[PDB]
Write an enzyme that holds these catalytic residues in place. Structure first.
Site, PDB file in Angstrom:
ATOM      1  N   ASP A 244     132.852 -65.893  23.623  1.00  0.00           N
ATOM      2  CA  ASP A 244     132.044 -66.928  24.267  1.00  0.00           C
ATOM      3  C   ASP A 244     132.309 -67.027  25.771  1.00  0.00           C
ATOM      4  O   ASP A 244     133.457 -67.175  26.193  1.00  0.00           O
ATOM      5  CB  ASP A 244     132.240 -68.286  23.559  1.00  0.00           C
ATOM      6  CG  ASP A 244     131.403 -69.455  24.057  1.00  0.00           C
ATOM      7  OD1 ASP A 244     130.418 -69.215  24.789  1.00  0.00           O
ATOM      8  OD2 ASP A 244     131.712 -70.605  23.685  1.00  0.00           O
TER       9      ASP A 244
ATOM     10  N   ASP B 149     125.877 -69.048  28.709  1.00  0.00           N
ATOM     11  CA  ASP B 149     126.602 -69.387  27.487  1.00  0.00           C
ATOM     12  C   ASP B 149     126.248 -68.447  26.330  1.00  0.00           C
ATOM     13  O   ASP B 149     125.127 -68.487  25.815  1.00  0.00           O
ATOM     14  CB  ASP B 149     126.352 -70.866  27.116  1.00  0.00           C
ATOM     15  CG  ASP B 149     127.210 -71.435  25.998  1.00  0.00           C
ATOM     16  OD1 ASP B 149     128.299 -70.881  25.738  1.00  0.00           O
ATOM     17  OD2 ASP B 149     126.822 -72.473  25.424  1.00  0.00           O
TER      18      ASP B 149
END
Lengths: 363, 62
Positions: free
Chosen positions: A218, A33
């Site tokens: 992201d 992440d």
């Protein structure tokens, strides 16, 4: 020095890396992440997870004497903050002492179908909870192993996995010239967005609206998330070139295996190059934004967002993204694995003029 | 495709609280396709009226 480790999963479920934690080492599945800065794992047994990290079974675990609560877009958790050794199987031979959060209570975090039981925060220290004082996984890795402050990603989930290079760039994972865009704010991976194009035709909006709250990259997020004011204009533009498909309430199925990609246009994102006067272009073909489900049914891979503009894993599946933290820049290059049976899904071009484009787009 | 018909009878495991238990021929409404992740989709059964996760391989389109 760079650690080239194989990633598992796809853009949908999320790209996860295998990790060995503690002594004796416990094998856990950790999601990569880039939109977070906390390295958290499950510390208690939970529903929809096969394994978790037991702190009492590890002899090298040192409890820091506190716990932290982290909230997401859809999910939240509270975990004991401590430190233990982390060894990556196929990667580096040596183990490293890093900060670890052991989740004891969570709300909508561990969901069904998800193969990971932990999260890897790869963004900047300022985002890390409780405060910036808590050293992120990569910051501890850069200090201990003495590796360049650069990490690169290559996603290959066309419909095997991926590659996460910790400590630099691997030239075999890309084709052509790397186009670098500077990081404006050192918190998330915020990059300056100047313009958006749909199959040649460009929509008109103040370039400050493209950077709504922040325009980030992201790996955790699946789809390309656009702000409420921007998303509406995109829906209108694609419709002119192409029932509840656009609102994500329904699908779009095309009979006898004929691809709907010929009917759909090309989405292009304009990012400011290191040299202020010039800018490059990252183009995504409908193969990446019209995702196949389950003759076959297809969904619209673009969703609105309340706060920020997110360049998700669906867009990152086409390009070899470089996170050069050492020189305050994000790299983009054409990927060889980003091809559905030979046919390319991504396009990278430049340099282009910014003469009739606003001086600054970050508000 | 708006609805999904159940191909096989599925009994959700006790350790799976968000999993829907269904009978063969049951109709479902998938809430949001944007939140879909993997082979498990959060649907709404037309028989019971409850919200929960269903296995994609167990259902067929309408």
């Amino acid at each position: 020095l760079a650690m080239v480790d194989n990633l598992q999963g796809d853009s949908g479920r999320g790209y996860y890396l295998e990790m060995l934690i503690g002594t004796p080492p416990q094998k856990l599945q950790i999601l990569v992440d880039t939109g977070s800065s906390n390295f958290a794992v499950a510390g208690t047994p939970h529903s929809y997870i096969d394994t978790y990290f037991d702190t009492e079974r590890s002899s090298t675990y040192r409890s820091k004497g506190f716990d932290v609560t982290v909230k997401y877009t859809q999910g939240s958790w509270t975990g004991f903050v401590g430190e233990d050794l982390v060894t990556i199987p196929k990667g580096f031979n040596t183990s490293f002492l890093v900060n670890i959060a052991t989740i004891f209570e969570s709300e909508n975090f561990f969901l069904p179908g998800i193969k990971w039981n932990g999260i890897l925060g790869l963004a900047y220290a300022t985002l890390a909870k409780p405060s910036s004082s808590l050293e992120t996984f990569f910051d501890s890795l850069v200090t201990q192993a003495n590796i360049p402050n650069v990490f690169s990603m290559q996603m290959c989930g066309a419909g095997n996995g991926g590659s996460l290079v910790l400590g630099g760039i691997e030239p075999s994972l890309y084709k052509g010239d790397i186009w670098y865009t500077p990081i404006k704010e050192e918190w998330y991976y915020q990059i300056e967005i100047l313009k958006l194009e749909i199959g040649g035709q460009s929509l008109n909006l103040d370039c400050r609206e493209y950077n709504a709250d922040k325009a980030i990259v992201d790996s955790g997020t699946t789809l390309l998330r656009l702000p409420q004011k921007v998303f509406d204009a995109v829906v209108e533009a694609v419709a002119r070139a192409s029932d509840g498909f656009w609102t994500g309430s329904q699908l779009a199925c095309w009979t006898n295996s004929e691809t709907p990609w010929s009917y759909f246009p090309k989405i292009s994102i304009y990012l400011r190059d290191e040299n202020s006067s010039r800018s490059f272009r990252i183009t995504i073909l409908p193969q990446l934004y019209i995702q196949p489900m389950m003759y076959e049914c297809y969904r619209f891979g673009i969703s609105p967002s309340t706060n920020a503009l997110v360049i998700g894993a669906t867009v990152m599946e086409g390009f070899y993204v470089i996170f050069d933290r050492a020189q305050k820049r994000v790299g983009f290059a054409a990927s060889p694995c980003a091809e559905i049976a030979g046919a390319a899904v991504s396009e990278i071009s430049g340099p282009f003029s910014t003469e009739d484009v606003a001086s600054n787009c970050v508000p | 495709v708006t609805l999904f018909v159940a191909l096989y009878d599925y009994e959700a495991r006790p350790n799976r609280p968000l999993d829907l238990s269904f009978h063969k021929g049951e109709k479902f409404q998938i809430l949001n396709w944007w939140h879909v992740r993997g082979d498990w989709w959060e649907a709404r059964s037309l028989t019971t009226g409850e919200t929960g996760y269903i296995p994609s391989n167990y259902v067929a389109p309408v």
